[PDB]
Amino acid sequence: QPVELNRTSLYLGLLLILVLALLFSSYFFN
Amino acid sequence: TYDDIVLANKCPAYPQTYRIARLCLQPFLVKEETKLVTRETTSLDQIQGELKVNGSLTFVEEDGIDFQPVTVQMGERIPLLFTVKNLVASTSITTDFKGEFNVPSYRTANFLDPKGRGLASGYDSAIALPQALARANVKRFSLTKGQISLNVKVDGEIAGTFESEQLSDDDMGAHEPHEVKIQGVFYASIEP
């Protein structure tokens, strides 16, 4: 079965990750 | 008057006991081992002393606004307590005033640092790092001497230009104070 990931889901899922890592980088560097 | 000023930072031969009644000093050469990032809270004013004739007029200052916290940007910011606190200067006044005063610490003993550490109040430890410094932990109050040479315009009210050499804030021992040379003008209003 093929995986569909439309461009909005690339855009939100990149938004989900980048603002997660903008959050947690302050704590991963600590 | 006060309404057309709010100039308050600016100061405006003459031949028995005499007194200096209103000594202003309006200035910052900082020795590399500037700018005025403090805006205009820099002048000394309303200083009252005692001009004691001996040939030399000894000027034991006593009272007045005679200290100003000044931060200058070298870009390193250099706090100095620009002051003439307890100055004894000495020279018919036409005339220099080769005087020596004491600067205190910038921050007094009540001052707390970002980690709560101060001299008379606060933590003698570094409570952030519980099982770990001693230079920043113990605050070391400085009182180093500064030297000023006023150079006397003359009316009862006289004026000219000073130049003081004092050290900077040493941050209660936590770093090295720069040698600040404070050039500027002055105005002293003598009255018996």
Added chain:
Amino acid sequence: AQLTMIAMIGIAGPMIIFLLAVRRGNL
């Protein structure tokens, strides 16, 4: 008392509305 003022001040608001209901007035 202050209450018996505020009772009859307060009751006689809806009694305007009670009368115009029980007289079929222009409510």
Added chain:
Amino acid sequence: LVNVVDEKLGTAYGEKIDLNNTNIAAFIQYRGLYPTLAKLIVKSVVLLTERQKQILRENLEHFTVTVETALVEGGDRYNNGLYK
């Protein structure tokens, strides 16, 4: 390098009224001293009015003379940021 205020506590400043270092508010613990004599003292163990001399002499065993530069500079002899 020791905290000079805390090193002042272990000597006779931190047992009595050090007449060169304590706040003018530390005179309220005895009679007669505050605020007229406390103004007169802050401004060897002190001696003026004659009733003031009798207040001081009755208090002279409570008085210490040991000047610490942190404790007195910046007008902390009169107000040290210590209130209620």
Added chain:
Amino acid sequence: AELTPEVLTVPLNGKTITLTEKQYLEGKRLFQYACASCHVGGITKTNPSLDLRTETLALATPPRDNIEGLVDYMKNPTTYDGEQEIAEVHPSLRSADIFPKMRNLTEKDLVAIAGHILVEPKILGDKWGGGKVYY
């Protein structure tokens, strides 16, 4: 506990006078009327050296841990050593001209402020005259 004559006995002059539950409740209110703007909780807001503690007041010159001493303070307020006279900066009955909240204080109504100032440290503890450390 309970407000009781063991709490309402306070030194009058070496004699103790007994307050009532009406009088202590009246003089809390007359303290909040004309005194507690500065003397909230037993401190002095305009001079945090001179708290209204009993030990402070017993050590004032003349002694002001008495009810006769506190009513003599509210008619003739002195400094803490009694040398200088402060009825021009402190509310009193010599200063009805300039402290209008003192004008309606009679000799059976000042004794309740003298009563409230002395009874309350036994009620609160260190909290009277203790400040925000003891709230």
Added chain:
Amino acid sequence: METITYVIFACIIALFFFAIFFREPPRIT
């Protein structure tokens, strides 16, 4: 290493630029 990692924010602006102007458009259907 610290600030230049944090300046992740430049990827967010590029995503802010891409998801506004280069989104797959809404189609009236």
Added chain:
Amino acid sequence: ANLWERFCNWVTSTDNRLYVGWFGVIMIPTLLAATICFVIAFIAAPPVDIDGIREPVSGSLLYGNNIITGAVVPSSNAIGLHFYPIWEAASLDEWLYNGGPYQLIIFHFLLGASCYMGRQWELSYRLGMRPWICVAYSAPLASAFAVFLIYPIGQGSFSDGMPLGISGTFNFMIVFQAEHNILMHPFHQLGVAGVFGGALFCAMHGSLVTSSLIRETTETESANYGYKFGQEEETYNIVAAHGYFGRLIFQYASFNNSRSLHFFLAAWPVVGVWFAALGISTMAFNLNGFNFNHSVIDAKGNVINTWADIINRANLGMEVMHERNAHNFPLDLA
């Protein structure tokens, strides 16, 4: 057909990918000035002496902050409420020291977010919409009005504004509770009732619509493709969701009217955050929260401490420690 009627044909045009509007002729250059100055101050601003007492607070990233502890530090307390543009200062380094970038950002942000609100009106008027998306944006905008402008005005200094920073915000919250008892202020409690309810009714409405979607797709692809954009059929059964949620509590607690439903979704967080912004705006003028310190006392008169007396000791903890060197006097008036 001069280049003015050709200019208003571009500014007011809905054919723009991002609508400009006349409010956007103020909104765009103010908010670009408030965004360019923000990220420059967030990375490279030298430390601002916020409290006016020559103790600078590092806010920017290059001076040893991360994004969490980074801020634009508010303008100096020596400045107070004074207008501090770049031309007030003798140099840039003086303007940077006394927190001039904060006044540049918040005066461009609030003037540009006020003009975001009327731009939200203006597109609703170009599109033939009903106009009150602007009114709902007045709830976060009053909040930004309050903590950036109004609470500085009441307290008399832009040093009391909320720092443009994550942990500077938390400084602003802690100090505010220490001085104004914001938790005991009912307008903040209506605001928490606006955001807890707002998050509730979001997850409520989000889950009752998602619960009620008509089968249009297979379980081998997403249910999101049952909606095609612009379709005329409603994509979920409103009668089933009301039948669900009405049986969940009781039938009459339930908006079986979609318009009355979405007014409630509109109005509950908006009137919530309105009141909460009115919390900050009224605690600007020190109309503090409810002060029940030593309220319950016994027969002897001993203070029986309450939960509001435990808050009061925490409130005392922050207030004797906020700006440890700024106070020379026993009462914290402003």
Added chain:
Amino acid sequence: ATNRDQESSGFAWWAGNARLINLSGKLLGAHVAHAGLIVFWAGAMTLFELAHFIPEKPMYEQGLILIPHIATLGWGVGPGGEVVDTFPFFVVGVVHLISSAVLGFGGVYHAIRGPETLEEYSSFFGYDWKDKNKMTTILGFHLIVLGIGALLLVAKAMFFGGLYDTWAPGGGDVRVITNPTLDPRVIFGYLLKSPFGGEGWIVSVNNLEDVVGGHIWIGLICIAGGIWHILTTPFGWARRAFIWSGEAYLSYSLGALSMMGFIATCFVWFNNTVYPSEFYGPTGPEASQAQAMTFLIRDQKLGANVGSAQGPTGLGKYLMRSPTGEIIFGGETMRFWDFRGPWLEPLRGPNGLDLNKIKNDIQPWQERRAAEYMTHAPLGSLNSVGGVATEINSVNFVSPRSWLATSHFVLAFFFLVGHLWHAGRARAAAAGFEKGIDRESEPVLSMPSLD
């Protein structure tokens, strides 16, 4: 029974006052009964404030907002804001409250008994909302009346007693302001003042000369703007710049009132001339400068060297410099160095505060006023516990200034929201889509795509 269900008006019960937009007789009685409510509250609160009034206590110590307004006018107060006759307060309470029954009669009459529209009985009183010259005629009538009202204040100030002057010599006294500022470069120079610190746009009006002369200027341009709007119709640039609807003029008034409530909040918070601290209490600025003065006084009385005394930070504990250079009060009150009150102008010389005027020249009325103003700061709680949020329940004090600024911020913000509500709606109503989008002619499906 027109416009009284949603069947006849299309307005529900919660917008049932909007059923009266085109009912001029009923909308008149709506406004006269509401005018009767304001004059009732003006009356009944003044009576409530004077029945619960202690003339020993100062006015700010009693939760009084309206007795300070009558006292500012120069009625029943003497030297230093002290009540000598409570009868001018009582008359203002009675003349308002009794007048509320007349407006209550006429509000009830026009609402529930009179002609529903005035357009038949009186073409002078009958108005259409979209008749533009009639809408200026009522605007011109109401401008002259506010010009009459802004000249009554000048009348009370210049003839009928004078207003309370905080800057009277020797303390505050009711002063006949006989030489008001007629100079427009001073009157309208307030308008070009910055709102920000040290300038304080029109809130910095600091004498009763500019107040009276500013109300001669406002009071006569409102007369001359009334004669303007009575004798003219709106011009063509304004006809295309406005919606001419009933809700439109409401929204313009709501937006004007949001300006006024935000300004009056700032007046009662910052100004101590038209809001004397004798009556309203010290301002936020006034109490912080009073605290720094009280300890400037206290410690120098113990012999502190207050000019050379240092804070913890290097600054002057009592006396530092403003960023312009003036000797100002040390501490956190450095933010309030732009504050002018009359209990510290004997300290202020030309460099700011004079240190030699602090040593041997601070009078005991100033020590009294600074200690009073420090312990009566406009800090307080919502249950009216005085002091900070960490204070104990002993002081029943919130300033009228805090009450007046916060209430007129709550009201002024909602009146901005009400402006945004009604200005959006009245422009949606004049274009024809406030009830929704027409499905048959939806604009966006006729509008091109974006990307």
Added chain:
Amino acid sequence: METLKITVYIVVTFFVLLFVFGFLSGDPARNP
């Protein structure tokens, strides 16, 4: 400072006159 002040002042008033004139240039007309 002397130059950037009037630089900002002209920039502000040009955008503000663009704001005021464009809402005076028939904003009631621009409805669907």
Added chain:
Amino acid sequence: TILFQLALAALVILSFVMVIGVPVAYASWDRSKQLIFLGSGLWIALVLVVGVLNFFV
């Protein structure tokens, strides 16, 4: 002085009948005309009788 409270309690009570009797008669005729007019003029009369007698007590 007590009959200053005979016109004042003839106005805290006549207002109580004219706070009901006016919005009831207006929202409900000829007797209501001769009862509103006779009493509203009496209400303007008794605010003047209280209005003169306060200066006499």
Added chain:
Amino acid sequence: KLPEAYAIFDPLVDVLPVIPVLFLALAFVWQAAVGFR
């Protein structure tokens, strides 16, 4: 205090300013008698 010929009617004045709060609530009584029609 009120002038001394007015203290009989002093509990009336103590609740006299609650009257404008009740005009708002009376519009809801009046709307409820008509059933909010």
